[PDB]
Amino acid sequence: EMEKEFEQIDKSGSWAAIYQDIRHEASDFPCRVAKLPKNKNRNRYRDVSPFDHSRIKLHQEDNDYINASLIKMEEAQRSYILTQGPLPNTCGHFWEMVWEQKSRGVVMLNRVMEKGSLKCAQYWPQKEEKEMIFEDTNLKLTLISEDIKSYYTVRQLELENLTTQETREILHFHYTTWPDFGVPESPASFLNFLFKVRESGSLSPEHGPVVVHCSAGIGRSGTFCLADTCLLLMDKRKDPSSVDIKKVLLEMRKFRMGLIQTADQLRFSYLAVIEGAKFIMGDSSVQDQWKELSHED
Template structure:
């Protein structure tokens, strides 16, 4: 028997072809509409940015109120973009060596860098992210200064001349010049004023004295100094120095002089080479010492008050190449040093003690 192939009915073929063609046309029209809309939006944004860029370039020459309004609008747009963005957290990179590495390096490091030497340490500070954008009030202050500079071309020169001719108001230094205190000064020409000096607690002092050659440096809050400026300790004033560190709540010391320069001692070494030393009622234990580069190193101390049995961790940043009556050879190294000091700053209640040789 012969089998017959029964053909499929083809009555719907024409209808389906029409539907397919219609869908294709609609899809093409949709794609073209999206492309046209995207192109139009891009052109509008590009034109808007171009106008803002032109206004920004004209701010330097335009010192009118319109320039200030334009700058404010730019600040608002910039701040709006900042609030919508969420930057990824930055992670500090640390080094791993066979020797024990100071945790100060892991907390303060900006990136992997070779370490000539290191000692052990305990965990200390956590980095706080720096602000990456400028607030509007600061921007307005800068803009106002620039506008005034355009009007007064000699302003900076006049300010510098006034700064050079500045003389401090006459103040008394009777406490620092007393017989029992004069031997605590490295120089008779660098004496603290009576009205602005750091006073120690007499009951905790080994010599029953409140004097130390140190002055507070105020910022905006006169109750809490941002810094304490002092001289390099003498062998007879080391206990006074650590008493000031303890009583001022200090956790950061910045030393801007080598211990020895050309055979002359610039500062007494007020910390132990290893282990611990006792200075009156203050026990200082060297926890770590990390050499960052040829110019500076970081030490970590464990400070204990034997009278109260309280303890505290103190970090010392020691700049090695700032010689007496000279300036550092590398500005970049000094800025790197300053950045690492700032990462340890704990706020207004903890002033940073800064000393070189005489001040």
């Protein structure tokens, strides 16, 4: 049971050991496509690649490669696409993927500039009157509105397939204060944001998988998805005791390498799930408490 385990790991100070054991046990699958010479400029990091078996294939139209993985959680009945922060030359590919996969939401957990370096391209428009056209993939993207909170921003975007003139509303959930290789400020701040994404309907099984990214699409992205999937599993069962967080993380790691990048991010995942369980099991009031503690205004 997660809370008993948490306390025992905390008491023995064994988070590093528990985390390294996950790393040891994690799946290793080929990434042959990611490593083709022609794809070198489509990868942000030499050593972070999608497995072949679970990579997202683009539908256009000469090179189908994007550094993105489908995390398909069978038991939970939820899927996510985890991807790197797009590069200056892959922003068209990124939106092509959103279109083809029928995603309704994009969750961004990094900033464009972190520690002095560009860790993600400016892939969405910052001003209504300055829309973006991706000529390579024939898409247009327009900022419709934004709601700026203290540590996150929600944006409404309109994505248009210029080939057909069909338009779709995409919601962008941008967590601006989650440091790289770090953790959210509190369980409250994290859960307030996760529940904002949930409330939007973006995770509905009626849509394609939500797109989640950070810079590599593994550390912060893995933490977010682990917490969400664990909460969903216990919600379906109404049984917190049934969820084995480490088992869930190892399952997710069948689909993309490196998910959760530090022992403290693993620790934080437990805190987030234990706290979120209060809401799942019927303490409605905790949601307002998180909103207050997150100081979002």
